[PDB]
Design a protein around this ligand. Structure first.
Ligand SMILES: [N-]=[N+]=NC[C@H]1O[C@@H](n2c(SCC(=O)NC[C@H]3O[C@@H](n4c(Br)nc5c(N)ncnc54)[C@H](O)[C@@H]3O)nc3c(N)ncnc32)[C@H](O)[C@@H]1O
Ligand SMILES: [N-]=[N+]=NC[C@H]1O[C@@H](n2c(SCC(=O)NC[C@H]3O[C@@H](n4c(Br)nc5c(N)ncnc54)[C@H](O)[C@@H]3O)nc3c(N)ncnc32)[C@H](O)[C@@H]1O
Ligand SMILES: [N-]=[N+]=NC[C@H]1O[C@@H](n2c(SCC(=O)NC[C@H]3O[C@@H](n4c(Br)nc5c(N)ncnc54)[C@H](O)[C@@H]3O)nc3c(N)ncnc32)[C@H](O)[C@@H]1O
Ligand SMILES: [N-]=[N+]=NC[C@H]1O[C@@H](n2c(SCC(=O)NC[C@H]3O[C@@H](n4c(Br)nc5c(N)ncnc54)[C@H](O)[C@@H]3O)nc3c(N)ncnc32)[C@H](O)[C@@H]1O
Lengths: 260, 260, 260, 260
């Protein structure tokens, strides 16, 4: 089975990568970073993010594995000392697949589309941030403030969390929108609360004056000029994980935030 | 078709109720508050809550209608001046059904079960509130504070909202747990963020010292003594609404909180 | 110099108390719990609270000392192993005084007055909590929700903190009001933000319907019936601490919440 | 008495400015925008901000007046239709002075100092924002997130408010620090709560890796490279308002946020 391995780049991660490759050499496993069926990421959640985007064009043909070298990561839930056990199980195909929902972002000017594993956020180019929020073609509110964040289920433990958003189990096909320092006057009104949308619901952000926005997708952040619309919806695409043992999302949340 | 009508009790509501009954008299409609197929609530969301609990034993045989007399209610989304149009459509059966998820609460000592349309909350009898939160048999945290609130999707716009919870579209089969003034020390740790659970996930609250709790279910609030466990899960039962026109949840949220 | 010692009641605290008394016996120190000039509290912040209220009638003649036996307390900032050094310094009068502001609460029906070291809160007797907030005789808002909390500066690290309140340096003569799960509709409006008031500002809570309130003052909580007004203001009275070394408030905040 | 008038620039504001000048011509009043004793700002709070910074070098020789043309502003608390009454009172010197505290910001690389009427905030140049917070020379925390905001008392109703900060009466000489989307892990810890500092307390932000910061002061925002320290403290300088009638801060808060 074709596979590839990305690395954080530091000494610890590269040597672990080299050892796993040597181990894979003792099995019927072909290293291939062009069309792998298995992508192993060694490092943190930031390394896993990169691995995901590196292969976002063939998400349906890939099963991802995360190794943390590293504090306990949400995506990288494998200890380094378990690497040898890992190469074994991967070789004999003793694993099933677990899928998480993704977020689709469409920027219309032409138009560009992006896929997020964590979230996509929108900010202004420097001036004040003012946008109209439209839900399924119905004007919901005019948001004034620092920006808006639209998170996937697995992304709720990231940026979303810092903004007061709720943590959602990744078996729920939804996206969550949170506010960033909204102005609430006797003249300016936002909902304040995070909003959780189901599949097929479309949230559209529309410029009021300034048409330039700094739009981020996970770790990537690009300036978009002359934007007519930003469109959010639960993607039809999903990310597939290879799971060899039980590591429940809530236990992962506990170990990362409460006590490990 | 059998039907019944509850009223807020004030002059406006009772007279509207009497007029609708007279109108139903002009059709093949039998008033029956023992086995109605249609329950019409005239008043506010508090009146609708009562109507729901009054008939929670036959939820699968009933379609609910809410009339607000009344500011725009989340459950009571019919204007009084539309009552005559309402009686018409109900008579000719020109309506489909919309269902919302419900919350099941199980209190073990024996055990009692309750059904919530909005939420179920837990507080102490007076002393400090300390409970262990267990998710699917795994200890998640030890909560210290004022209490915990477990909300249905449609209930997220109620008490849940005041506690910083997210608003969830009621087509999502989930429950949301929020904290009430949790103590977060260098010794006491809670997740802080709201938690959204899917169907079949079980959240269990377990006493640490005091075994007495003030437990609320929607408008009802009873003291429970010698509690061994409080168990939350998305109910297998659902509430059924009769819908005659489009009134989207998000538009309802907008009209109630942003601008009507 | 007259002195007295209160104890948490457990083995550790009582024996420490007995040892300190024996140590004081080696100096010109008279034990007196009726008119002490020095009150030593051994236990936690809950024990210190009790010591304070036990002697709130002679606050200007007393210097308080807190010993934690015990995690690091905000009021009890002395390690048990430092007790012997403590008895020494207290005997030779090698200490200056540090004062913190207090909160005065006046309940009118007749009227009762209370003094708080941490905070005073107001809740309903069971029904909904609705009160008019009047600042210096000007109606500020009508609050609907679970309740209101008025905190002293040193109390801001307590209940106030759990409600989203700010931490205030105790050299600032002020009181801070925070909300408890306020309902914010398109019909019900509260400020949302905590409010910090200076000396001589008077905040008055006035019933709208229900005249019965559960009113707490620090650890004490009594039901008041037929209340006409609750009045908050920075007290003219202050609590006096005896300080032998530098232990800055912000360092105390750090050790309690960040890392000790 | 020397005076000057700034304007929002729109038709309404300029004509009001021209009329007031004509009115001042009927009295012993000399227009002078180089050394005015009275600065009148016509527009919004953004116009008042500009007027303040335009003359921040002679704050002790100036009394500011704000006219809103305009919704009710916090600094611009004069209705346009009251302009004629205003010119009268100003001419006869029938006014006393009210002073609000200011915030001093010192950026060391050399060093630059800035004065804020509302707040000063710090963000990263694009990468992650990581800084060490030092209070009076004692390391308090390592902040990871979007940024930090340090607000004056009168500024608490602005940006500070959107970040969950408390509203402080401007008679209190203090500054308030609030967080912007802080990361709180089991490895990263911030206080979370807003912090209110008194006069003479110094808060210092120190780079951990990236030494470049986008630093804002009210409406102004400049990038600073190779920063060694950002230092916050309550300024010795104060802004002076000319007051002709009672318009209490809390009433101003009410009219702006609750109901006008
Ligand atoms: N910057 N940053 N992130 C540091 C933390 O991000 C973590 N992380 C990561 S990836 C690490 C990384 O480099 N991430 C870039 C991410 O930082 C997040 N972020 C940003 Br941008 N601003 C943030 C902010 N202000 N607070 C918290 N997180 C923020 C946001 O999720 C963005 O995709 N993914 C998750 C996840 N799903 N759940 C919980 N944590 C996650 C890493 O473990 C690390 O601990
Ligand atoms: N108390 N109260 N509730 C007043 C508001 O509750 C509204 N309401 C109602 S029912 C009215 C009533 O009497 N409700 C009792 C409910 O009050 C809510 N509640 C409580 Br208890 N404490 C609250 C609090 N502190 N803040 C806000 N809501 C609170 C909680 O949802 C409880 O079930 N249902 C909803 C709903 N699903 N979404 C939004 N609003 C709802 C009514 O419209 C009314 O405006
Ligand atoms: N309940 N309780 N309190 C537990 C914590 O209170 C601490 N404490 C105490 S006293 C301990 C005690 O028994 N306190 C009763 C206090 O509990 C606080 N409280 C209440 Br009531 N409800 C709370 C809640 N929901 N969350 C946090 N604190 C709450 C409130 O301050 C009340 O006066 N004083 C302080 C203080 N000034 N700053 C920080 N912590 C303080 C103790 O150290 C203990 O860790
Ligand atoms: N951007 N903006 N501000 C719009 C509002 O700022 C108001 N304003 C102003 S000045 C208007 C303006 O142009 N201000 C620039 C200010 O915007 C504030 N600000 C920023 Br930057 N980001 C914000 C944000 N995300 N949310 C709220 N306010 C924000 C911040 O206070 C900054 O100094 N001062 C006050 C004040 N002291 N209290 C309350 N409101 C104030 C104006 O009335 C206007 O309604």
């Amino acid at each position: 089975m074709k596979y590839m391995i990305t690395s954080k780049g530091d000494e610890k991660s590269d040597l672990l990568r080299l050892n796993m490759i040597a181990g894979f050499g003792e099995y019927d496993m072909e290293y291939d970073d062009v069309e792998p069926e298995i992508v192993i990421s060694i490092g943190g959640d930031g390394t896993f993010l990169s691995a995901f985007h590196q292969y976002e064009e063939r998400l349906d043909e890939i099963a991802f594995i995360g190794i943390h070298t590293g504090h306990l990561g949400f995506y990288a839930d494998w200890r380094p000392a378990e690497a040898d056990k890992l190469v074994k199980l991967l070789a004999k195909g003793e694993y099933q697949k677990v899928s998480y929902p993704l977020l689709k972002t469409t920027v219309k000017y032409k138009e560009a589309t992006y896929l997020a594993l964590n979230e996509s956020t929108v900010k202004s180019s420097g001036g004040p941030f003012v946008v109209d929020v439209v839900i399924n073609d119905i004007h919901f509110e005019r948001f004034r403030g620092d920006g808006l964040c639209m998170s996937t289920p697995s992304g709720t433990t990231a940026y979303n969390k810092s903004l007061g958003g709720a943590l959602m189990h990744p078996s729920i096909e939804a996206m969550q929108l949170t506010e960033m320092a909204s102005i609430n006057n006797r003249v300016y009104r936002t909902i304040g609360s995070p909003l959780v949308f189901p599949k097929h619901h479309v949230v559209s952000l529309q410029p009021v004056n300034d048409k330039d926005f700094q739009i981020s997708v996970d770790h990537l952040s690009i300036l978009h000029r002359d934007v007519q619309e930003i469109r959010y919806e639960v993607s039809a695409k999903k990310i597939h994980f290879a799971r060899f043992r039980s590591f429940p999302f809530w236990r992962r949340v506990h170990d990362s935030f409460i006590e490990d």
